[PDB]
Ligand binder design. Structure first.
Ligand SMILES: Cc1cc(OCCCc2c3n(c4c(-c5c(C)nn(C)c5C)c(Cl)ccc24)CCCN(c2cccc4c(C(=O)O)cn(C)c24)C3=O)cc(C)c1Cl
Length: 149
């Protein structure tokens, strides 16, 4: 119940603060410090990988044809297909979240900023439902931060 809350918190914060250039006006909620270290890891690595995959991400966005929140409810299935099953590791996870961050930037640009919030949820939903057991075998986000030092 709570690990989903933690992950969702991190992703929503990262996506918003990537979309807007701001750094939030408060700290984090319950389990806040681990979530902060995760968010700063994201700050570094997400921008790096987004720069590396600018071409593929930008062409995919060119395809995705996103207009409103209904598009958000219809994109989760493409996200699931691309993230699917097979090789599981932290790099693919940060890549998931990083494409979420680019999508959030774009949504703010088209003034459809309100769609950033369901997006994160969808990401987070797909993130837990598909990797839950493995995440606990990584003691959650602890495996994340320690991996990326
Ligand atoms: C529609 C949508 C999806 C989203 O993300 C879904 C998963 C992330 C993603 C992947 N990929 C994406 C691509 C993409 C496509 C399609 N083609 N190319 C060349 C790229 C870069 C795009 Cl454009 C956007 C997101 C992703 C494919 C290549 C990277 N990867 C990958 C595959 C296999 C092994 C490894 C690997 C290792 O070695 O362990 C490390 N990673 C990075 C690997 C992906 O799973 C997110 C949101 C919010 C939305 Cl709404």
């Amino acid at each position: 119940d709570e690990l989903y809350r933690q992950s969702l918190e991190i992703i929503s914060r990262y996506l918003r603060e990537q979309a807007t250039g701001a750094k939030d006006t408060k700290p984090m909620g319950r389990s806040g410090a681990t979530s902060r270290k995760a968010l700063e890891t994201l700050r570094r690595v997400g921008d790096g990988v987004q720069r590396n995959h600018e071409t593929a991400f930008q062409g995919m966005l060119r395809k995705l044809d996103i207009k409103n929140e209904d598009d958000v409810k219809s994109l989760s299935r493409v996200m699931i297909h691309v993230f699917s099953d097979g090789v599981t590791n932290w790099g693919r996870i940060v890549t998931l979240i990083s494409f979420g961050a680019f999508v959030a930037k774009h949504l703010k640009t088209i003034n459809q900023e309100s769609c950033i919030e369901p997006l994160a949820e969808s990401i987070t939903d797909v993130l837990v439902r598909t990797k839950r057991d493995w995440l606990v075998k990584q003691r959650g986000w602890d495996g994340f931060v320690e991996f990326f030092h």
